[PDB]
From a paper:
Cyclotides are a large family of topologically unique peptides characterized by a head-to-tail cyclic backbone and three interlocked disulfide bonds. This combination of structural features forms a cyclic cystine knot (CCK) motif and confers cyclotides exceptional stability. Cyclotides are divided into three subfamilies: bracelet, Möbius, and trypsin inhibitor subfamilies. Since cyclotides were first reported two decades ago, studies on bracelet cyclotides have been hampered by their low synthetic yields because of poor oxidative folding efficiency.
Since Ile-11 appears to be critical for folding of bracelet cyclotides, it was of interest to explore the capacity of this position to tolerate another branched residue, Leu. Surprisingly, the four [I11L] mutants exhibited yields from 13%–44%, which is lower than that of the [I11G] mutants but still substantially higher than that obtained from the native parent peptides. When the Ile was mutated to Leu instead, bioactivity was retained. Contrary to the [I11G] results, the [I11L] mutants exhibited equipotent binding to the POPC/POPE (80:20) model membrane compared to their wild-type counterparts. [I11L] mutants exhibited similar or slightly higher cytotoxicity compared to their parent cyclotides, whereas the [I11G] mutants had substantially reduced or no activity, which correlates well with their membrane binding. Overall, these results confirmed that the [I11L] mutants retain the biological properties of their native bracelet cyclotides. Using this I11L mutation, we synthesized all d-enantiomers of I11L mutants of bracelet cyO2 from Viola odorata and bracelet hyen D from Hybanthus enneaspermus. Having determined the crystal structures of wild-type cyO2 and hyen D, we were interested in definitively showing their Ile-11 to Gly and Leu mutants have native-like structures to support our earlier NMR chemical shift analysis. Their structures were solved using racemic or quasi-racemic crystallography.
Author numbering: 1 to 30
Amino acid sequence: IPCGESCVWLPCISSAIGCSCKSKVCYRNG
């Protein structure tokens, strides 16, 4: 599920809420 954050050039600030970079945007479990 996309979280609402791009990660093309920086990692996910939303890593704190569980979101990780895949396919240039931040996701939690799809």
